[PDB]
Write a protein that binds this ligand. Structure first.
Ligand code: HEM
Ligand SMILES: *[C@@H]1O[C@H](CO)[C@@H](O[C@@H]2O[C@H](CO)[C@@H](O)[C@H](O)[C@H]2NC(C)=O)[C@H](O)[C@H]1NC(C)=O
Ligand SMILES: *[C@@H]1O[C@H](CO)[C@@H](O)[C@H](O)[C@H]1NC(C)=O
Ligand SMILES: *[C@@H]1O[C@H](CO)[C@@H](O)[C@H](O)[C@H]1NC(C)=O
Ligand SMILES: *[C@@H]1O[C@H](CO)[C@@H](O)[C@H](O)[C@H]1NC(C)=O
Ligand SMILES: [Ca+2]
Ligand SMILES: [Cl-]
Ligand SMILES: [K+]
Ligand SMILES: [Zn+2]
Ligand SMILES: [Zn+2]
Length: 595
């Protein structure tokens, strides 16, 4: 509320109700309500927003005001007391590859983005936020608690800007502030193609009628394509090494260069689109560039859907997968396809799955040169290590043969993210993702832990002893009670991630319910779901069933040895097979003549 920094460009389109292709914006998916799931609309509210003043001020804004008669603890203080840890020894997930973590961030970026208020460029506002730590309007700074080492080294706060929100509309009657989702709620490879028509065009190769995506013209990975550079200045990717001066990539998603392995996955996905386009041109020489672009985009979309639902969700949801995502029963136009506000916090479980280092491995999956293993923080907004230090293959090998961090109640978020995060506007490896997540929960008017437990039909702990029983952890429950005083005030991000994981899963009960419900809606509410009859032919669906991440790697790198099950922990060579033994995508069912 209070209009400073609101709204988004929602362009009005007339719907082609008979197109066999998704729109870029996600409009026209639901025929009765064409905006359901589209980009640049409010996140859905599963529960009503909870603000300090009932409208827009987050809990923790006014020093006098309590939440249920208790002060809310500082975000940085929750992080210091509970989220940090020293010893990286034995922290690794023994049955999840690093690809497990990385695929999570990919799916998340496809589904939701809540961009920070653009106070504008040229800002004295940025100055009063970063330099003077002054709370007001969109500046909601993360204040350091007493004894914080960052007090001695950085200043009084980390700067923090409130998320974008819907503009008050001409009734202008009093409503709770609603944050915007800038990407399509559909699992539709929007992170490759864009959620905005203008960027979608700019990303395409329109010089040739071959339906390709634009590729870098200054740099090649032993003949394989790189994403184009984003030429917008100043560049955070240039800032982290001004000698090398390699800019950030330009992708369908603003966040693609945030860390080197995300950039890697974006590169693999772009290569696959061009491979699909080239193969379809061979099968159908009469097909034009639009047709080729849309058909490759339509396949890559299904690829993301199949990998997510067949390979990823089962090993996240474990025993709860069947309860929340039973067998598909066809498209239901009454299901809400939109991403909920709470989901964008629930999926941040992945921040406890990121380890402290990244490795480049050689063709024998051995340490690649003398600086093989690098600290994660050196790789935020880092494109020069790809362009000028061996391409993506050595990073992709590390994705296969290295492990995700395991979530640990005593070891939650590696110091690489908790103390050394780099933000694209700022100059320091000095931010705390855990403190930002907690601040952001409050920014977004999140109901509290016991609110969501109830939403999920779970018991709502009210005492120390009750919380100890939910967490199966005496000390964690005590630290939480000392900070929050009531489990009612525990911010959903820490509350959900504190719970011991469900059987065969990587999240606890509350997160299994919130994620499960959302992924059920993402499938059932999507008119272009790959299994919805008439989206693909039956023969095309038989072809699609054989896709794998292992094949993506074989088709789009010079790696010739890969595991069959890329998401579990895999050791070279015992667990790796030659690419020739891995099922391919049979494209003959897309062959199209007139006779
Ligand atoms: C750097 C960051 C990562 C890795 C080194 C990382 C990783 C993940 C994984 C693995 C996720 C899911 C399985 C995931 C989800 C979401 N993230 Fe997170 N992430 C890194 C950095 C960030 C930053 C910075 C943000 C924004 C924080 C803010 O509130 O201001 C962030 C957010 C999210 C998020 C909300 C929507 C989005 O931007 O993705 C997730 C669902 N991540 N990350
Ligand atoms: C757009 O597509 C065209 C045609 O495929 C690309 O052009 C060629 O690029 C390759 C690699 O640079 C060369 O080996 C060919 O000799 C080029 N052919 C022509 C017609 O010039 C072009 O580079 C693509 N553009 C972008 C930005 O990706
Ligand atoms: C790793 O997880 C997968 C889950 O589908 C399972 O098939 C495999 O046997 C597991 N390995 C373990 C638990 O060591
Ligand atoms: C910057 O990149 C160059 C090569 O371009 C390398 O030799 C140097 O170590 C890098 N510097 C930093 C600050 O990482
Ligand atoms: C479709 O959606 C609505 C709301 O989710 C639900 O009441 C109904 O049972 C569903 N119908 C079918 C046919 O699955
Ligand atoms: Ca999407
Ligand atoms: Cl919500
Ligand atoms: K992110
Ligand atoms: Zn090569
Ligand atoms: Zn700064």
């Amino acid at each position: 509320s209070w209009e400073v920094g609101c709204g988004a460009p929602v362009p009005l389109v007339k719907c082609d109700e008979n197109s066999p292709y998704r729109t870029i914006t996600g409009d026209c998916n639901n025929r009765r309500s064409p905006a359901l799931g589209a980009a640049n609309r409010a996140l859905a509210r599963w529960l009503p927003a909870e603000y300090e003043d009932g409208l827009a001020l987050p809990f923790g804004w006014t020093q006098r005001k309590t939440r249920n008669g208790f002060r809310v603890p500082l975000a940085r203080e929750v992080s210091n007391k509970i989220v940090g840890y020293l010893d990286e020894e034995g922290v690794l997930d023994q049955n999840r590859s690093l690809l497990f973590m990385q695929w999570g961030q990919i799916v998340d970026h496809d589904l939701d983005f809540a961009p920070e208020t653009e106070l504008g460029s040229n800002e004295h506002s940025k100055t009063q936020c970063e330099e003077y730590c002054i709370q007001g309007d969109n500046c909601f700074p993360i204040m350091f608690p007493k004894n914080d080492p960052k007090l001695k080294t950085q200043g009084k706060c980390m700067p923090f800007f409130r998320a974008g929100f819907v503009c008050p509309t001409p009734p202008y009657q009093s409503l709770a502030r609603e944050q915007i989702n800038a990407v399509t709620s559909f699992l539709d490879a929007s992170l490759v193609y864009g959620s905005e028509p203008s960027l979608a065009s700019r990303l395409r190769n329109l010089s040739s009628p071959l339906g390709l995506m634009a590729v870098n013209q200054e740099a090649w990975d032993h003949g394989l394509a790189y994403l184009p550079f984003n030429n917008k200045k100043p560049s955070p990717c240039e800032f982290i090494n001004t000698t090398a001066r390699v800019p950030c990539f330009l992708a369908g998603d603003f966040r693609a260069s945030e860390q080197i392995l995300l950039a890697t996955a974006h590169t693999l996905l772009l290569r696959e689109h061009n491979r699909l386009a080239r193969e379809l041109k061979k099968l159908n020489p009469h097909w034009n560039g639009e047709k080729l672009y849309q058909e490759a985009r339509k396949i890559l979309g299904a690829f993301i859907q199949i990998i997510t639902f067949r390979d990823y969700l089962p090993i996240v949801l474990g025993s709860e997968m069947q309860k929340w995502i039973p067998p598909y029963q066809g498209y239901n136009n009454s299901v809400d396809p939109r991403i909920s506000n709470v989901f964008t916090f629930a999926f941040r479980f992945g921040h406890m799955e990121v380890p402290s280092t990244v490795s480049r491995l050689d063709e024998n999956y051995q340490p690649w040169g003398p600086e093989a293993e690098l600290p994660l923080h050196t790789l935020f907004f880092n494109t020069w290590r790809i362009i000028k230090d061996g391409g993506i293959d050595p990073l992709v090998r590390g994705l296969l043969a290295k492990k995700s961090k395991l979530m640990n109640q005593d070891k939650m978020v590696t110091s690489e993210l908790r103390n050394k995060l780099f933000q694209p506007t700022h100059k320091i490896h000095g931010f705390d993702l855990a403190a930002i997540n907690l601040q952001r929960c409050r920014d977004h008017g999140m109901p509290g832990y016991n609110s969501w437990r109830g939403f999920c039909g779970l018991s709502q702990p009210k005492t120390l002893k009750g919380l100890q029983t939910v967490l199966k952890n005496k000390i964690l429950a005590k630290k939480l009670m000392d900070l929050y005083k009531t489990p009612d005030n525990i911010d959903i991000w820490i509350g959900g991630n504190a719970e011991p994981m469900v059987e065969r899963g990587r999240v606890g009960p509350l997160l299994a319910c919130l994620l499960g419900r959302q992924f059920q809606q993402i499938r059932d509410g999507d008119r272009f779901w790959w299994e919805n009859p008439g989206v693909f032919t039956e023969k095309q669906r038989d072809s699609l069933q054989k896709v794998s991440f292992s094949r993506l790697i074989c088709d789009n790198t010079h790696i010739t040895k890969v595991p069959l099950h890329a998401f579990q922990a895999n050791n070279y060579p015992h667990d790796f097979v030659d690419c020739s033994t891995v099922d391919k995508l049979d494209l003959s069912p897309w062959a199209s003549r007139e006779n």
